[PDB]
Design a protein around this ligand. Structure first.
Ligand SMILES: Nc1ncnc2c1ncn2[C@@H]1O[C@H](COP(=O)(O)OP(=O)(O)NP(=O)(O)O)[C@@H](O)[C@H]1O
Ligand SMILES: O=P(O)(O)O[C@@H]1O[C@H](CO)[C@@H](OP(=O)(O)O)[C@H](OP(=O)(O)O)[C@H]1O
Length: 270
């Protein structure tokens, strides 16, 4: 029915407010005129609320009767290349990121990180990518909100193809119609991405696919979160499949989407 960090209730029905970020505002404005228009939440412009700027977005949960939601972070890389430059010239040591690391694998931090009780953001993000499915499959499950009100973010070590399949298997709860609709939507999204003027021109980092379904077998998928999506310089383009090597700005977005369609197609035959 309604999603209600960055989010606030909107005046108009079926809308949601999200804290304005300049990269995200640029991106949503472009996407409304792109092949991808139908694959992203409708963007209605910016509004002021308590002296601060908000994106007026379509509430993706509005069409659904008690929605189940899964957030899938897309790409082999989850940080901008500029973070790698900043961490070499002027590292911001992060003590929070060190404690999250210790918790999952106490042997993961180096002798110096242990001494620092702190890690760089890129180091933490590369580690996160490697213990989840991000590095190998080019996406990872971030979270589920079920129809019973229960939520989980317990997916940091969800890595193998079969582990990912079991999360989707539990998420769709044997609803053949929801899974068929999800696969049809993902096939149509892949086709739209492969012709999109926006997509060939932009490095898409930190974006998610939001899967939404309900007990009436309504099912939708949208791309969300363009806070780290940046244009390539002087008419350079990405294939979004080839491996990332510092300088090439490749995100593996379509490697991810390919693997995700493969896993859902496998689940459909089980
Ligand atoms: N347009 C939308 N309508 C309804 N729910 C949304 C919408 N956009 C995002 N959400 C929900 O809010 C969550 C956060 O979205 P996101 O755009 O990633 O926010 P963020 O705080 O900017 N980034 P992140 O750090 O990745 O969570 C999603 O996982 C959804 O559950
Ligand atoms: O999911 P966990 O393991 O908690 O890690 C978190 O992953 C976010 C991306 O999902 C990052 O956000 P980002 O989109 O890069 O701004 C956070 O970074 P930050 O603390 O804000 O510098 C980072 O801690």
């Amino acid at each position: 029915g309604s999603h209600m960090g960055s989010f606030k209730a909107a005046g108009t029905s079926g809308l949601i407010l999200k804290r304005c970020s300049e990269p995200e505002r640029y991106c949503l404005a472009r996407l409304m005129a792109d092949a991808l228009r139908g694959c992203v939440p409708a963007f209605h412009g910016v509004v002021e609320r308590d002296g601060e700027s908000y994106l007026q977005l379509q509430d993706l949960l509005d069409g659904f009767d008690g929605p189940c939601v899964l957030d899938c972070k897309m790409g082999v890389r989850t940080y901008l290349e500029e973070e790698l430059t900043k961490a070499r010239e002027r590292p911001k040591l992060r003590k929070d990121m060190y404690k999250k690391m210790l918790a999952v694998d106490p042997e993961a931090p180096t002798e110096e990180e242990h001494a620092q009780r702190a890690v760089t953001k890129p180091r933490y993000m590369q580690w996160r990518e490697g213990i989840s499915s991000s590095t190998t499959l080019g996406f990872r499950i971030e979270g589920i909100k079920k129809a019973d009100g229960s939520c989980s973010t317990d997916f940091k070590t969800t890595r193998s193809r079969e582990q990912v399949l079991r999360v989707f298997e539990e998420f769709v709860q044997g609803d053949e119609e929801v899974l068929r609709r999800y696969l049809n939507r993902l096939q149509q999204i892949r086709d739209t991405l492969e012709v999109s003027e926006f997509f060939r021109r932009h490095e898409v980092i930190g974006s998610s696919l939001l899967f939404v379904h309900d007990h009436c077998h309504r099912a939708g998928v949208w791309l969300i979160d363009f806070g780290k999506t940046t244009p390539l310089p002087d008419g350079q383009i990405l294939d979004h499949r080839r491996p990332w090597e510092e300088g090439n700005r490749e995100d593996g977005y379509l490697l991810g989407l390919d693997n995700l369609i493969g896993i859902l197609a496998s689940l459909a035959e089980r």
